[PDB]
């Protein structure tokens, strides 16, 4: 999918998941995945997955993109807020991706 650089904004779920600093939030066919740089490798490596079917809700403004993962997600439930100036673009990319589940 398409990738966005984002900055983890503290929430209870983010703190338990050890999140902090910059990441790549990727909007794929059937999920949202959070990536980081491989120490060795220096390429993007998946950190967390969130299938669209397990997100309760998601939103965005000119300052961030956030979503509320439900219980069956690997991360646990809660709100995951990411500082970015592209929230609307991430919102619109997830929007469509979920839309294509017209299959």
């Amino acid at each position: 999918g398409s990738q966005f650089w984002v900055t983890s904004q503290k929430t209870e779920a983010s703190e338990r998941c050890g999140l902090q600093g910059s990441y790549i939030l990727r909007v794929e066919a059937e999920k949202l995945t959070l990536l980081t740089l491989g120490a060795q490798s220096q390429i993007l490596e998946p950190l967390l997955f969130w299938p669209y079917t397990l997100l309760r809700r998601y939103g965005r403004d000119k300052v961030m993109f956030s979503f509320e993962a439900g219980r069956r997600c690997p991360s646990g439930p809660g709100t995951f807020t990411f500082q970015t100036s592209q929230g609307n673009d991430i919102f619109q990319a997830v929007e469509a991706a979920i839309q294509q589940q017209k299959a």
């Binding site: 079917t53 309760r56 998601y58 965005r60 403004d61």
Partner: peptide, 8 residues
């Protein structure tokens, strides 16, 4: 901002 995800 938000929308509840119907694919839930």
């Amino acid at each position: 901002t938000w929308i509840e995800n119907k694919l839930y």
